Amino acid sequence: MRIILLGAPGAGKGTQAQFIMEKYGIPQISTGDMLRAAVKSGSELGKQAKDIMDAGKLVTDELVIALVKERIAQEGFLLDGFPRTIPQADAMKEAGINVDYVIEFDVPDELIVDRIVGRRVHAPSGRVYHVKFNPPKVEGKDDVTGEELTTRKDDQEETVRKRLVEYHQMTAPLIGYYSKEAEAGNTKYAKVDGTKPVAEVRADLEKIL
């Protein structure tokens, strides 16, 4: 089972990715987690992402396409934050990487900033929380390791605004792209209401999947 999750910054893609991973045994391929990993470990394929991610900008198509091809070689899958541009989507289709399901998370722009201000992460695992809407079982702590949660460098309101602009400029056109793919019989397309509670979005995804 090959799945693409599509949606604005903060739509809840990674939150739902965890549930699909721990159910259908489908590995999460989070380009965002992989680039943050490669920055910390100074890795050749990604270490260059640091200033771009701090700016709220997209990393170059060719770097992430290489990153994804490499990670794919080592495996079903769930693509989370890739593709992010038409040229990334075209690269998957040119390399014959077909998917069974494309799932669009619909969340109004007006929720995103206010949403991401509450985001807390366990960097080592990529588990993510929200201080109000999906809190850890113990305030400030990872549920599994008990380690103090952190705030991502790029989750400052200014950087989120910039990320949401780049999403509408560069990424939102993938909605049309994969809808045409579904129209040609190449994949299933489904939309989920990302404003519902975490639990309901999870059940909506189980109905689709």
Numbering used by the authors: 1 to 75, 80 to 213
Paper text:
AK plays a key role in maintaining ATP levels in cells by catalyzing the reaction ATP + AMP ⇄ ADP + ADP. It consists of three domains: the large CORE domain, the LID domain that binds ATP, and the nucleotide monophosphate (NMP)-binding domain that binds AMP. X-ray crystallographic studies showed that the LID and NMP domains undergo a major conformational rearrangement upon substrate binding. This movement, termed domain closure, forms the enzyme’s active center and helps to exclude solvent molecules that might interfere with the chemical reaction.
To probe the origins of SI further, we selected three variants of AK with similar thermal stabilities to the WT: L82V and L107I, which are more inhibited than the WT, and F86W, which is not inhibited by AMP. Further, a crystallographic study of one of the mutants also did not demonstrate a structural change that may explain the effect of AMP. In particular, we determined the crystal structure of L107I AK, which shows strong inhibition, in complex with Ap5A to a resolution of 2.05 Å. As no differences in the static structure of AK were found that could explain differences in enzymatic activity, these are more likely rooted in dynamic interactions. Contrary to this expectation, the enzyme retains significant residual activity even at high AMP concentrations, as seen particularly well for L107I. Interestingly, both closing and opening rates were accelerated in the binary AK-AMP complex. This effect was particularly substantial for L107I and L82V. A C50 value of 2,568 ± 820 μM was found for the WT, with significantly lower values (~500 μM) for L107I and L82V. Moreover, L107I was shifted further toward the closed state (64.8 ± 0.5%) than it was possible in the presence of ATP alone (55.8 ± 0.8%). Under these model assumptions, a simulation of the enzyme activity at a saturating ATP concentration (1 mM) and varying AMP concentrations was able to qualitatively reproduce the SI pattern of the WT as well as the mutants L107I and L82V. In reality, the potent inhibition observed experimentally for L107I and L82V might also be influenced by a slower transition between ETMinhO and ETMO for these mutants and also by other parameters whose accurate values cannot be determined currently.
